[PDB]
């Protein structure tokens, strides 16, 4: 009856709300209109989503994703209307707004995403009222998986972390220094590659130098992004796998910088379902 | 007459030496064999160097450049041989070895380059004996023009430096944030773009936040790169426009970190002239 989606770098999460039930665990590839053509997006829904659905008939669709800024929402709406039989309404907005709806519902707060990339905004309870452009894995995106990966690879290859952790990393991911350079400078989606090797931090978090890398990265995200908003007045909510799997260090960073922490959740899907059952039910 | 050259990402510096005199000072574009075919290098030499010479006869050529690793030495040497009339010797090596010969001559030393990129090595008096791979403008290249540019843009756009400096930057270079994202992530030579806007720091160095940016970047270069070497035994030499035009801050970084600076020079040409005169 209702279809909801949150689209990230790696995957899109789809949920169906129908007759008081939730059907989750429906995944496709990411669906970012800055990186995919309308025919690529259409091909992807047709081939990978529709087979997982009993029907393509829906009352409403609420699609959220990276790249679904104003300029791109008509494109995405178009793709969806061509694949799905939607009787009422198709909403398209950003992953950030999904994170806000999930974590804050209908009330105000500071909302942050910490996954492959990172992002932060002020949500007024209805819409994003302010935001800090992340700037990508090179210039910004502090605390993201990609930046964590960027920091780690720099530390290991420059021998900042000793021989053992370096060789353990290269052996684990079957990388040479030459391969890493190739992938970072000369292949598509280097941010994805870097994020993909960042779990090495969580696995080795016991090492003081690893713990420190993560702590400093997070402090950097908070001071450069979150502290731009009225943080002494509003809780900051965090959504994403980086936020979640390094939750202890994120709280440590917040205590050290002076930020009131709120929700820390792995993904916004549970919160979005709450949104569409409770608050958004009425409209 | 002998011809000496030091080639980086921006320029190739050439000197003609004859009878104890420097007979010409000539610039062409950079010639990196990883970024140019042998053909393209030949054309650039013929079109831009040769018109600036009054003969193409040299006893020796000594060409130093980024990318001129052993793998590429035959390719570069062949282009030079096909463009010039050299009687005795064509030597081809790295910009790093040029910095070493210039700053150290025949004595050991720690040698660093701080230009568009950065690099650090130990020179044993004859050849480079050890080095720290720079890792490029994303992963490494601490203290480089590219990285200074990267730090600046982040700081300005994320409002860490005030509104005035941000507006001044965007106005000066006729840039929007959209343009910047485009140039950094989706256009060729993003490191060159970043390095190309880095002079804004030198132009605004009296601003505390600007000075702070540069000091911290230099500290990071020293701790991550130079300190890998036997720096209490050898003084560290610095070659490059970034090392030169931020000399005072580099010395401050060095004193803060316990590194003993030697030579700080804009480029190795002076030193290379001394080298070939002994
Ligand atoms: N168990 C785990 N331990 C450590 N890191 C993990 C992890 N599971 C995932 N990650 C890391 O989290 C990052 C991606 O998390 P997430 O799935 O939230 O990103 P995403 O790309 O879908 C959101 P966006 O694109 O909006 O930033 C990657 O860096 C990944 O390696
Ligand atoms: N007067 C000046 N003040 C500050 N920065 C300067 C400068 N002149 C050049 N730069 C910057 O220095 C960087 C390059 O340094 P340099 O001039 O040594 O060239 P390079 O590193 O490409 C070696 P080569 O000269 O052989 O090409 C660029 O970011 C450039 O804009
Ligand atoms: Mg120059």
Numbering used by the authors:
A (entry chain A): 1 to 283
B (entry chain B): 1 to 278
Which passages does the manuscript contain on this structure?
Unlike other bacteria, the pathogenic Tannerella forsythia, a member of the red complex group of bacteria associated with the late stages of periodontitis, lacks biosynthetic pathways for MurNAc production and therefore obtains MurNAc from the environment. Sugar kinases play a crucial role in the MurNAc recycling process, activating the sugar molecules by phosphorylation. MurK and K1058 are two sugar kinases of the cell wall recycling system of T. forsythia, sharing a sequence identity of 44% and separated by a single PGN-scavenging operon within the genome. Structural and sequence data showed that MurK and K1058 both belong to the group of ribonuclease H-like kinases and are members of the ASKHA (acetate and sugar kinase/hsc70/actin) superfamily.
We successfully cocrystallised MurK with AMP-PCP (termed MurK/AMP-PCP) and established its structure at 2.12 Å resolution. Crystals of MurK/AMP-PCP were monoclinic and contain a biological dimer in the ASU. The AMP-PCP is clearly bound in both protomers of the ASU of the monoclinic crystals. AMP-PCP is bound at the N-terminal domain via a conserved DxGxT motif with interactions of the side chain of S9 upstream of the conserved T10 residue, both forming hydrogen bonds to the β-phosphate group. T116, also conserved in the homologs, is located on the opposite site of the phosphate entity and forms a hydrogen bond with the β-phosphate of AMP-PCP and the γ-phosphate to the backbone amino group of G117. The adenosine is bound mainly via van der Waals interactions contributed by nonpolar residues but forms hydrogen bonds via the carbonyl atom of A195 towards the hydroxy group at C2 atom of ribose and a water-mediated hydrogen bond via S198 to the adenosine ring system. In addition, the aromatic ring system is aligned coplanar to tightly pack against side chain Y244. Finally, S241, part of a conserved IGSV sequence (residues 238–241), stabilizes the α-phosphate by hydrogen bonding. Only minor rearrangements for ATP binding were observed, with an Cα-RMSD value of 0.78 Å, aligning all residues of the N-terminal domain of MurKapo and MurK in its AMP-PCP–bound state. This is in agreement with the observation that ATP is predominantly held in place by residues of the C-terminal domain.
